[PDB]
From a paper:
The enzyme cyclic di-phosphoglycerate synthetase that is involved in the production of the osmolyte cyclic 2,3-diphosphoglycerate has been studied both biochemically and structurally. The reaction involves the transfer of the γ-phosphate group from ATP to the substrate 2,3 -diphosphoglycerate and the subsequent SN2 attack to form a phosphoanhydride. Since the cDPGS reaction is exergonic at cellular concentrations, cDPG accumulation is favored thermodynamically until this reaction reaches equilibrium. cDPG appears to play a role in the thermoprotection of proteins, and increased thermostability has been demonstrated for several model enzymes in its presence.
To elucidate the substrate binding residues of cDPGS, the structure of the 2,3 DPG, ADP/Mg2+ bound enzyme complex was solved by molecular replacement to a resolution of 2.2 Å resolution, resulting in Rwork and Rfree values of 21.5 and 25.6%, respectively. The 2,3 DPG binding site is located between the C-terminal domain of the one protomer and the N-terminal domain of the other protomer of the dimer. The ADP and Mg2+ are clearly resolved and reside in the pocket formed within the C-terminal domain. The 2,3 DPG is clearly resolved in only three of the four protomers making up the asymmetric unit of the crystal. The helices α5, α8, α9 and α14 show a motion of up to 8.5, 7.0, 6.7, and 2.6 Å, respectively. Residues K145 and R146 move closer to the substrate to form multiple hydrogen bonds with it.
Numbering used by the authors:
A (entry chain BBB), B (entry chain AAA): 2 to 460
Write the structure that this text describes.
């Protein structure tokens, strides 16, 4: 039993006595103390004229914005810090706040580690365990199949080229209760080895297995359930994974998220992935802006037709620069890279990609690697339709080129090995669309250097 | 302390064992029982071949949609009803749910009186006291200055013409702890009477005062603080206002809201006001669709340039009919009606209306009532600029025509009475833009008849 420190957000669209009654009712609760009050706008009542008049009558310190027509975001942030608030309680309404303004206020309050709540809603700030004994980056994103894993694999290779030994702790959508370690820095991960793991009941197409193969690195397979609006998760073993990663042979750590969910482990720096294919409201409203606000570097992905228009790409770029002008921003597209040789082969291509981009990926594969793609399955995520596509194409291909994602091991690899084909795993590589935005390796190196410098200087 | 019945929302983007662990963790909590699970979509992490395995392995009943690509909204609603669930717990994430899908799920769950919550968020359903002993309508809206009061005054007069005696309980953002009673059916409310009230410290420009004067009815002045996202309020005396309304001389009750807030008293039927001037996201996302879903009749307001484009008005109409197909929908604009005679007089017009629409209101006043508008103040909300306009124009006018809103009594009426002018109070009348949408009085009568029929039969 200890009191929670509450800041009240109030407005001049309410008459002061009903506000005073509300603050006295909140303060007179057991386990709550109202420590400050912020007037967030409105002027219908100005009979009480002076912040010191309001403060005298409340017996609480009272804060106002420089402009009564605008939400005093900076004053709310400064007040939550100054009074070290546990809770910010919203006693406002239209016209002073709409949903957009509430999510803007929420994004500030939750970042300072305070609860944001009102009459009918509550938001919990992200728990964040300070457990890593190595310099580190978080790789998070706004959704699924936007390239969090693809960017993470690439970043690991860049960090290796920079003469560091990276470990990826991947927060996946399942896995053993004790996090599993994959020594992709020591072990030759083949199709037959992945099937041997799948036969033991191991989730061999998970991101830790993919990053181990695609980037030849040590990885730790963690699990989670649920992924909230702000990005928190219901249960996870990622804290245990970060503890494991400390003890193993590595000298840089990537904490990689899943879906819109954020690993609850403190890192020196953060890379945020944003698919230009996603609705603008998911990027510029709700807790999109909160996620973009965490970034040192933003990778915008899917920056091409048919996935996004030029105007959409420019709108996403413009918004990111407005809300996070400190962040470096790189717009990108994904292109395939086989982890093996496919030159002059008849190729069956297996992917999770949208059907509208398969033609472009095939055109690229044939033009660059000199293969002939005899058939495609975009159904790695759908086991019945996958088997249908395999029976159609399997006989006319020399080898199957597959993403190491979804049913790629226990269905597609199994069928291809029993049919006597070679199986080559396929990475997705982030390629910069526009050289005016500079080089993606240099952008990652900048963030890696910041993470190392931060770790050396802060204890 | 009593056990709360929880339904879990789960997906096939999580591997079964981490979902099972999550459900066992939730069920093993004190005063929570997991009673059912709804599988809301996704496929790739289903190694389970038969959906019956899922329920067998959880030891919980599990319900599925007909289409694994779509959220089974209907199944969620049917299960919350069937189990009389207190909580719905979201153990999903991107790609299966985005923010929009979560607000669609929230709107269903909260309407059935269940909490909706996830990893980092919680939403509380509306408190609703069952206290009225008379047939009744709630008049609520999506914002401020969208015409809730204007529609409410009109509805009261329509109910009077239909041979009933209506009472308006107005939930404002201010007023005495004991609700204030105004007998506008028995008292001739003059400018001098309103100044006598303002000098006693009464909020004479409040909605209960306005409805009393504009509609010559009994009204009860209630107060509240805060207005949440769903529309709940932190504190209010509206329960006491409804108890007062039962005792007094009336045979129909209108419970009128304020801002986006909803009076927490049960009513037979609901009228929802939606300003077409508001951003589409506030109408078609968050808890706009929840508010529109409460409606028997939706009044769309501000349906003209400069406030809304024809395309906007059509988008609002189309959306409302999609989410609430049995609701009657009437698109409208507001025009002045003096509560007195202004024919051939020199008029100083005082309003809270935007500068961009004053010309249309003036053009209407002069064309309909044959007055000469010698000047306008759009500054009833801004006491300094109001006095500047009054000093300029007061000498030119025979009478001041004013909305009974904001500084209309304690500044504008006071200056006009001391300057020896007549003061005429001005209603805002909802006018239907297109006769193909039918007559607004008939639309109100339909809802009033439903409220009377419901009241007679639900006893
Ligand atoms: N040019 C492209 N346009 C659109 N999608 C692409 C393109 N190239 C690859 N993809 C798809 O992008 C996705 C990247 O997925 P992944 O790296 O697993 O990201 P995440 O961790 O965000 O799910 C895959 O589904 C892949 O097939
Ligand atoms: N034609 C019009 N276009 C736009 N606004 C108008 C028009 N006519 C009146 N108004 C304004 O509409 C508002 C209606 O306010 P009111 O009836 O108090 O509704 P609420 O209770 O929702 O605030 C007032 O500010 C009034 O001046
Ligand atoms: O499940 C899917 O991805 C496709 C079906 O794939 P095909 O059977 O057309 O290959 O759904 P659709 O796009 O037809 O609505
Ligand atoms: O706050 C309230 O009591 C009412 C009126 O405000 P005022 O007209 O008294 O400023 O709000 P609304 O019905 O306009 O949303
Ligand atoms: O407050 C307002 O609406 C007016 C007041 O100034 P005047 O209209 O009295 O000049 O300024 P604006 O917003 O048009 O710049
Ligand atoms: Mg207390
Ligand atoms: Mg991934
Ligand atoms: Mg329990
Ligand atoms: Mg009103």
């Amino acid at each position: 039993g200890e009191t929670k420190k509450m800041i009240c957000l109030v407005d001049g669209e309410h008459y002061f006595p009903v506000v005073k009654d509300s603050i006295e009712i909140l303060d007179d609760l057991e386990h709550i103390d109202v420590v400050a009050v912020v007037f967030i706008g409105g002027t219908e009542k100005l009979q009480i004229e002076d912040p010191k008049e309001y403060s005298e009558k409340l017996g609480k310190p009272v804060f106002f914005g420089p402009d009564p027509k605008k939400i005093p975001y900076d004053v709310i942030k400064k007040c939550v810090k100054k009074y070290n608030a546990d809770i910010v309680m919203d006693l406002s309404d239209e016209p002073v706040v709409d949903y957009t303004k509430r999510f803007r206020i929420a994004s500030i309050v939750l970042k300072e580690g305070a609860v944001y709540q009102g009459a009918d809603f509550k938001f919990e700030p992200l728990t964040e365990y300070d457990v890593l004994e190595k310099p580190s980056i978080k790789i998070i994103g706004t959704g699924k199949r936007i390239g969090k894993t693809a960017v993470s694999a690439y970043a690991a290779r860049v960090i290796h080229k920079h003469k560091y030994n990276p470990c990826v702790v991947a927060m996946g959508r399942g896995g053993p209760r004790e996090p599993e370690i994959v020594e992709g820095n020591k072990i030759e991960i083949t199709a037959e080895y992945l099937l041997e793991q799948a036969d033991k009941g191991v989730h061999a197409a998970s991101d830790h297995w993919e990053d181990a193969l695609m980037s030849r690195i040590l990885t730790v397979g963690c699990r989670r359930c649920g992924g909230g609006m702000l990005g928190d998760t219901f249960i996870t073993n990622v804290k245990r994974g970060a503890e494991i990663a400390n003890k193993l042979d590595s000298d840089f750590v990537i904490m990689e998220g899943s879906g819109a969910a954020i690993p609850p482990v403190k890192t020196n720096r953060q890379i945020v992935t944003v698919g230009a294919n996603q609705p603008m409201i998911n990027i510029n409203n709700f807790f999109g802006p909160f996620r973009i606000g965490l970034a040192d570097l933003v990778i915008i992905t899917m920056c091409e037709e048919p996935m996004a228009t030029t105007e959409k790409i420019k709108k996403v770029e413009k918004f990111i620069k407005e809300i996070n002008p400190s962040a470096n921003v790189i717009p990108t597209v994904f292109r395939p890279k086989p982890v093996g040789n496919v030159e002059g082969k008849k190729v069956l291509f297996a992917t999770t990609a949208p059907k509208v981009v398969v033609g472009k990926l095939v055109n690229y594969l044939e033009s660059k690697y000199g293969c002939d793609v005899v058939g495609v399955t975009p159904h790695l995520s759908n086991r019945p339709l996958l088997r249908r596509d395999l029976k159609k194409y399997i006989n006319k291909a020399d080898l199957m080129l597959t993403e190491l994602k979804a049913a790629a091991v226990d269905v597609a690899t199994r069928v291809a090995i029993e049919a006597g084909l070679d199986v080559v795993y396929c990475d997705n590589i982030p390629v910069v669309i526009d050289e005016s935005y500079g080089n993606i390796d240099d952008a990652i190196i900048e963030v890696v250097e910041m993470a190392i410098d931060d770790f050396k200087n802060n204890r």
